Design a protein around this ligand. Structure first.
Ligand SMILES: Cc1cn([C@H]2C[C@H]3O[C@](c4ccccc4)(P(=O)(O)O)OC[C@H]3O2)c(=O)[nH]c1=O
Ligand SMILES: [Mg+2]
Length: 194
């Protein structure tokens, strides 16, 4: 039997936080912003809303804009790590990502992004869903702390991928982290093998 690993896209493969900040500052130069070092909480618009009135609506307009997802930069070592992971024996890798509600560009751009960095053949490994608990696997590497859905008992072990917004979070045992792609991801996968 092959080990199945679900790899998240935003915050794990694609730099959503960095891309957001860069484009927000460029479009709203006279507005206050939040340095990544100061990001707290999964929801960007919520922390921006607390910064000053009207920043939430502006933040939202950034990711709803054409080319936001397509132009995100890969996280350091992400492409290299996933390519190697997918080539490993007895290992099936799927990119499991949740598209935003405004569907005009997001779904399309995510497929285009994967084609760009992983090639045409990797498109077969993409799973788009707003509920990752109904996708079965041994592991789910994702930066969102709370991953819930229709399935109360997911088959996967959620390994928290470190991001600016979750770096200070204390996890309840035996929950663990993958600190970055430079961290030992192979050791994590092996711990799940027969
Ligand atoms: C992946 C990511 C998106 N956003 C943005 C983008 C937008 O995505 C969703 C949204 C909710 C649930 C599943 C998918 C998208 P929306 O419900 O608008 O589709 O929730 C609110 C918004 O929050 C962040 O702030 N941080 C993140 O790490
Ligand atoms: Mg993510």
């Amino acid at each position: 039997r092959a080990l199945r690993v679900l790899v998240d896209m935003d915050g794990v493969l694609a730099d959503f936080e960095g891309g957001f900040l860069r484009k927000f500052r460029a479009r709203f130069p006279d507005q206050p912003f939040i340095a990544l070092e100061d990001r707290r909480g999964f929801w960007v618009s919520e922390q921006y809303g607390r910064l000053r009135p009207g920043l939430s609506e502006k933040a939202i307009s950034i990711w709803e804009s054409k080319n936001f997802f397509f132009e995100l930069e890969p996280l350091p070592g992400a492409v290299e790590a996933v390519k190697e992971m997918a080539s490993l024996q007895n290992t099936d890798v799927f990119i499991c990502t949740s598209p935003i509600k405004m569907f005009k560009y997001c779904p399309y751009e995510k497929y285009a992004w994967v084609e760009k960095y992983f090639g045409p053949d990797f498109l077969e490994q993409i799973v788009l869903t707003r509920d990752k608990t109904v996708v079965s696997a041994d592991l789910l590497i994702d930066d969102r702390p709370d991953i819930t859905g229709a399935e109360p008992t997911p088959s996967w072990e959620h390994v928290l991928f470190t991001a600016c917004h979750n770096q200070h979070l204390q996890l309840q045992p035996p929950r663990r982290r993958l600190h970055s792609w430079a961290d030992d991801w192979k050791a994590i996968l092996d711990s799940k093998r027969p």
